[PDB]
Write an enzyme that holds these catalytic residues in place. Structure first.
Site, PDB file in Angstrom:
ATOM      1  CG  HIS A 265      19.323  -4.864  -8.774  1.00 32.54           C
ATOM      2  ND1 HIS A 265      18.719  -5.947  -9.199  1.00 32.54           N
ATOM      3  CD2 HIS A 265      18.325  -4.026  -8.287  1.00 32.54           C
ATOM      4  CE1 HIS A 265      17.444  -5.823  -9.008  1.00 32.54           C
ATOM      5  NE2 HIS A 265      17.201  -4.674  -8.463  1.00 32.54           N
TER       6      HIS A 265
ATOM      7  CG  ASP B  24      20.543  -8.917  -9.745  1.00 30.48           C
ATOM      8  OD1 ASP B  24      21.250  -8.282  -8.983  1.00 30.48           O
ATOM      9  OD2 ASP B  24      19.374  -8.676 -10.016  1.00 30.48           O
TER      10      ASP B  24
ATOM     11  N   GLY C 282      10.398  -2.788  -5.772  1.00 29.26           N
ATOM     12  CA  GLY C 282      10.196  -2.898  -4.306  1.00 29.26           C
ATOM     13  C   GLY C 282      10.266  -4.385  -3.973  1.00 29.26           C
TER      14      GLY C 282
ATOM     15  CB  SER D  48      14.550  -5.793  -6.638  1.00 30.84           C
ATOM     16  OG  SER D  48      14.065  -5.350  -7.907  1.00 30.84           O
ATOM     17  N   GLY D  49      15.128  -8.589  -5.144  1.00 35.17           N
ATOM     18  CA  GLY D  49      15.894  -9.226  -4.028  1.00 35.17           C
ATOM     19  C   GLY D  49      15.111 -10.295  -3.330  1.00 35.17           C
TER      20      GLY D  49
HETATM   21  N1  LIG Z   1       8.567  -6.475 -13.750  1.00 32.72           N
HETATM   22  C1  LIG Z   1       9.224  -7.079 -12.787  1.00 32.72           C
HETATM   23  N2  LIG Z   1       9.046  -8.369 -12.582  1.00 32.72           N
HETATM   24  C2  LIG Z   1      10.120  -6.360 -11.973  1.00 32.72           C
HETATM   25  C3  LIG Z   1      10.792  -7.025 -10.891  1.00 32.72           C
HETATM   26  C4  LIG Z   1      11.682  -6.370 -10.041  1.00 32.72           C
HETATM   27  C5  LIG Z   1      11.890  -5.052 -10.282  1.00 32.72           C
HETATM   28  N3  LIG Z   1      12.638  -4.230  -9.641  1.00 32.72           N
HETATM   29  C6  LIG Z   1      12.484  -3.092 -10.244  1.00 32.72           C
HETATM   30  C7  LIG Z   1      13.182  -1.941  -9.873  1.00 32.72           C
HETATM   31  C8  LIG Z   1      12.874  -0.701 -10.424  1.00 32.72           C
HETATM   32  C9  LIG Z   1      13.558   0.439 -10.071  1.00 32.72           C
HETATM   33  C10 LIG Z   1      14.578   0.368  -9.153  1.00 32.72           C
HETATM   34  C11 LIG Z   1      14.953  -0.852  -8.548  1.00 32.72           C
HETATM   35  C12 LIG Z   1      16.026  -0.894  -7.626  1.00 32.72           C
HETATM   36  C13 LIG Z   1      17.255  -0.264  -7.911  1.00 32.72           C
HETATM   37  C14 LIG Z   1      18.316  -0.266  -7.009  1.00 32.72           C
HETATM   38  C15 LIG Z   1      18.164  -0.910  -5.788  1.00 32.72           C
HETATM   39  C16 LIG Z   1      16.977  -1.532  -5.490  1.00 32.72           C
HETATM   40  C17 LIG Z   1      15.935  -1.524  -6.393  1.00 32.72           C
HETATM   41  C18 LIG Z   1      14.231  -1.984  -8.931  1.00 32.72           C
HETATM   42  O1  LIG Z   1      14.546  -3.194  -8.350  1.00 32.72           O
HETATM   43  C19 LIG Z   1      11.661  -3.092 -11.276  1.00 32.72           C
HETATM   44  C20 LIG Z   1      11.298  -4.369 -11.266  1.00 32.72           C
HETATM   45  C21 LIG Z   1      10.399  -4.975 -12.150  1.00 32.72           C
END
Ligand SMILES: NC(=[NH2+])c1ccc2[nH]c(-c3cccc(-c4ccccc4)c3[O-])cc2c1
Ligand SMILES: [Ca+2]
Ligand SMILES: [Cl-]
Length: 223
Positions: A40, A84, A175, A177-178
């Site tokens: 994503h 993912d 922020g 993510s990944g």
């Molecule tokens: N509670 C957690 N452990 C968690 C972990 C990773 C996450 N990533 C995100 C997230 C929220 C909004 C947009 C993106 C996003 C969307 C598209 C591209 C990159 C990031 C997120 O990864 C929430 C989020 C919450």
């Protein structure tokens, strides 16, 4: 990362920042020309930034390399976030040293209880947005499958695992993510999703990397 600590400059040498004029996701360097991130986080115009600590200041040790191609897993489902994972090939290889190093893929999956290190430049507030300049770290354990499934009934597939604290207070967040979940020196997870950040009984969910090692290997070998 909510409830974590400042890692210390370059103490997580395999951490990369995916940048398109701002930081939008993290990733892990697994060899000198390939990075693993979340599907994503895919977009075009990705510049991979290695050897970073403060992402808003060039402090030295940084290497900015453009992505030559990004390979989203073919069975990625954007509605369930199943599969993912994404591989990014760098335009030129990176110079590895003590500040920029790759992390090993696992040979076996980890067990519940295993303590891992999660890192990233994501939000540090669960209620609000505060983005850090330097890299944050959090030590968190992998939860058992039952606790994970009881927290997210009907949304956990065999390619996901939960890690964190059910009492709330410490979690990865937007922020992050990944990015990497490293346990015993092996990359066992990729930050994928969660409900809010650091909320009680809503742990973070991660892509279970041990399930994709042959796929990563075969894909890199043919690209
Ligand atoms: N509670 C957690 N452990 C968690 C972990 C990773 C996450 N990533 C995100 C997230 C929220 C909004 C947009 C993106 C996003 C969307 C598209 C591209 C990159 C990031 C997120 O990864 C929430 C989020 C919450
Ligand atoms: Ca910097
Ligand atoms: Cl279920």
């Amino acid at each position: 990362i909510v409830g974590g600590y400042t890692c210390g400059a370059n103490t997580v040498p395999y951490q990369v920042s995916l940048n398109s004029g701002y930081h939008f996701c993290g990733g892990s360097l697994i060899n000198s020309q390939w990075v693993v991130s979340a599907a994503h986080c895919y977009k075009s115009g990705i510049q991979v930034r290695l050897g970073e600590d403060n992402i808003n200041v060039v402090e030295g040790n940084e290497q900015f390399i453009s992505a030559s191609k990004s390979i989203v897993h073919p069975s990625y489902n954007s509605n369930t976030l199943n599969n993912d994972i994404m591989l990014i090939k760098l335009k030129s290889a990176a110079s590895l040293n003590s500040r920029v190093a790759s992390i090993s893929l696992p040979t076996s999956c980890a067990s519940a209880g295993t303590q891992c290190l999660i890192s990233g430049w994501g939000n540090t507030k669960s209620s609000g947005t505060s983005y850090p300049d330097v890299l944050k770290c959090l030590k968190a354990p992998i939860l058992s499958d039952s606790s994970c499934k009881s927290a997210y009934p009907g949304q956990i597939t065999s390619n996901m695992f939960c890690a964190g604290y059910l009492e709330g207070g410490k979690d990865s967040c937007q922020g992050d993510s990944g990015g990497p979940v490293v346990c015993s020196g092996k990359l066992q997870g990729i930050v994928s999703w969660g409900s809010g950040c650091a909320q009680k009984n809503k742990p973070g969910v991660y892509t279970k990397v041990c399930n994709y090692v042959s796929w990563i290997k075969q894909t890199i070998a043919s690209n």
